[PDB]
Amino acid sequence: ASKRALVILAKGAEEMETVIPVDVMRRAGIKVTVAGLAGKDPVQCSRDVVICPDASLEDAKKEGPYDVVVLPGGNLGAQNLSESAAVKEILKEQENRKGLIAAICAGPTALLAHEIGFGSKVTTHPLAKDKMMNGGHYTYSENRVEKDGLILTSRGPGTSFEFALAIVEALNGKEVAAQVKAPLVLKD
Amino acid sequence: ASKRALVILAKGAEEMETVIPVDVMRRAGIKVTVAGLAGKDPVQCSRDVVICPDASLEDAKKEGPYDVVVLPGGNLGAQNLSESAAVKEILKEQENRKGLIAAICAGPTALLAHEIGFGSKVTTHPLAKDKMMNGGHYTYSENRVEKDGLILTSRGPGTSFEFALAIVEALNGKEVAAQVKAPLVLKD
């Protein structure tokens, strides 16, 4: 009866946008798998924080399905996610089974690369807007967190806590999110 | 002419309180060394995020001095910091040369263990207040970030961004902190 989350970690990922949702989701009792795009080896993030994934993406793919797939940001991390056929397969499957997809900052641009969620309202980092809107396939929002159907997006490292708590609320409900939030000493 | 920061990483450290300051400080051009208390081996943080340190504490000790020493929180991480003679030596030296000392959440309780900064105004996580105030050696503050002389403290994971930007402001000045802050998409 435990919810499962998949976090896809690629080189160049924004380490804050990776660790905050993983940490907060585990505080909420969610079983999180941090999967390395390139394998089990340690991943050098955009500001040179090196994180050891729990599993390779190939192995984590086999232990699905997941209630949420999480795409961190980081310009180079998002590009690696956009170019990966394994990610395309995971996202299309997640879209078909009406699972939640979450991406933050530059992460949403991978949704465009893989033709995911066209027609949805989305947000990105302001610097990634032009890339996300190429072709007019989405409607752009400037909300710090945006949720349209099964697509949940957020803007930047400074929105990571709201992004993560929105995932908790979608999976475990508003009360669990509120309980998890109080010991964090967030402003609002 | 580059400022240097030492971040001491021990098992049980709060991974958000470790990665956010490291990331933000490197965005500010600060040379950050994430030093493992127990050696170069990967460190399992409080929510099971595993981080590879840049160096062992023994090696990083030799490449000082540092303009700031950073003590992350996490109850079990702070206890490991409180029990380490190597940390006592680093902090006493840093106090003597009037360097900046920064600790967040449960991290400040290590200052009490090592008799650092007595008489200063400090803050902690609300749950760590009683431990920090044993003996009345400090004056307690409920500010999200508190700075008294060379002692800079903060309350929790949700204050990590303000904590980190306060370090940047102390080392590199208000303008650099403001420049680094804008792309983060923080609320206030």
UniProtKB/Swiss-Prot annotation, chains A, B:
CDD domains associated with the record: GATase1_DJ-1
Effect of substituting residue 9 to P: Abolishes detoxification activity on methylglyocal-adducted CoA
Disulfide bonds: none
N6-acetyllysine PTM sites in chain numbering: 147
Cofactor note (record): Deglycase activity does not require glutathione as a cofactor, however, glycated glutathione constitutes a PARK7 substrate.
Lipidated sites in chain (S-palmitoyl cysteine): 45, 52, 105
UniProt superkingdom: Eukaryota
Name of the molecule in the record: Parkinson disease protein 7
Lineage of the organism: Eukaryota, Metazoa, Chordata, Craniata, Vertebrata
Gene: PARK7
